[PDB]
Amino acid sequence: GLVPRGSHMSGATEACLPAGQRKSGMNINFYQYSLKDSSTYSNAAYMAYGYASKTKLGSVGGQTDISIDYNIPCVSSSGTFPCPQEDSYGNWGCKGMGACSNSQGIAYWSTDLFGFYTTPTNVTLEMTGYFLPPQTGSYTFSFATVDDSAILSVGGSIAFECCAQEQPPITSTNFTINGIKPWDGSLPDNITGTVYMYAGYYYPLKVVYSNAVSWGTLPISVELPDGTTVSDNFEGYVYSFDDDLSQSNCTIPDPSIH
Ligand SMILES: [Cl-]
Ligand SMILES: [Cl-]
Numbered sequence: 001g002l003v004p005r006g007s008h009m010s011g012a013t014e015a016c017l018p019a020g021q022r023k024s025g026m027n028i029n030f031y032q033y034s035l036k037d038s039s040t041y042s043n044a045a046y047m048a049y050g051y052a053s054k055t056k057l058g059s060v061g062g063q064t065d066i067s068i069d070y071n072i073p074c075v076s077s078s079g080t081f082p083c084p085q086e087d088s089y090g091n092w093g094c095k096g097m098g099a100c101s102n103s104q105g106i107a108y109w110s111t112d113l114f115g116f117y118t119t120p121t122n123v124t125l126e127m128t129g130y131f132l133p134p135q136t137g138s139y140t141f142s143f144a145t146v147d148d149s150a151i152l153s154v155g156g157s158i159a160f161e162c163c164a165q166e167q168p169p170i171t172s173t174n175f176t177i178n179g180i181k182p183w184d185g186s187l188p189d190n191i192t193g194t195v196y197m198y199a200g201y202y203y204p205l206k207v208v209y210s211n212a213v214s215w216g217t218l219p220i221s222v223e224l225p226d227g228t229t230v231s232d233n234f235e236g237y238v239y240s241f242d243d244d245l246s247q248s249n250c251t252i253p254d255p256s257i258h
């Protein structure tokens with residue numbers, strides 16, 4: 001057969017070939033999320049698109065270093081220092097700092113999240129960009145843990161529409177990784193989703209992340225088809241393009257036959 005037969009029943013992930021000026025990194029949009037609201041982010045509709053119905057706080061572009069690791073302050077005898085969560089104890093202190101005088105349960109202001117001055121204790125953010133696979137094959141994306149609620153979506157009409165990165169979010173709830181905070185209880189660690197990708201195509205990528213209280217954590221990784229792992233720093237893999245809703249050929253519904 002002169003040509004590949006194509007993935008079974010339109011099974012391939014939709015990708016894109018934007019013709020515009022490529023920019024290194026992801027765009028991060030920040031939206032309001034209420035301190036101690038442990039229910040809003042438990043809804044699929046909210047995590048897929050509803051977050052953008054809340055007040056948009058701001059944005060930062062060109063982000064390649066994408067894992068989230070936010071630590072609240074411990075106001076201690078020696079000054080004020082961020083406390084790794086696993087070092088917090090009692091009611092409460094931080095190991096190597098003694099007792100902390102401040103509440104774990106109030107809002108805290110910090111630039112920890114991509115240099116944007118906001119409240120990482122209570123916020124929802126949206127990461128958008130395109131993932132560029134250097135190798136053809138199966139890619140396994142993972143969250144090592146989720147504090148508090150998160151999704152990852154890959155693919156045209158799943159993350160967002162090709163050449164329309166900056167548009168309001170689409171409604172698809174067909175998440176690649178579903179790390180939505182369960183109504184009852186939590187989820188295991190190392191939650192994963194696999195996508196088969198063709199080298200040199202641009203795959204829309206969306207990560208929506210929310211925290212309601214104190215610590216926030218989202219360590220992001222991908223395992224390449226060659227078995228190596230890229231964690232946190234996605235430089236060389238993630239790019240942004242300004243919208244071009246007029247580029248007619250931008251969507252590749254089936255990269256296996258394109
Ligand atoms: Cl601090
Ligand atoms: Cl201590």
Ligand SMILES: [Gd]
Nearest residue numbers: 065066067232
């Ligand atoms: Gd980082």
Ligand SMILES: [Gd]
Nearest residue numbers: 065066232233
């Ligand atoms: Gd960094």
Ligand SMILES: [Gd]
Nearest residue numbers: 065067069232
């Ligand atoms: Gd770092």
Ligand SMILES: [Gd]
Nearest residue numbers: 068069070112
């Ligand atoms: Gd951090």
Ligand SMILES: [Gd]
Nearest residue numbers: 111112113114
């Ligand atoms: Gd940071």
Ligand SMILES: [Gd]
Nearest residue numbers: 069070082112
């Ligand atoms: Gd840091």
Ligand SMILES: [Gd]
Nearest residue numbers: 065067069112
């Ligand atoms: Gd950092």
Ligand SMILES: [Gd]
Nearest residue numbers: 156157161162
């Ligand atoms: Gd579409």
Ligand SMILES: [Gd]
Nearest residue numbers: 213214215216
């Ligand atoms: Gd949290």
Ligand SMILES: [Gd]
Nearest residue numbers: 223226227228
């Ligand atoms: Gd492996």
Ligand SMILES: [Gd]
Nearest residue numbers: 166241242243
């Ligand atoms: Gd733009």
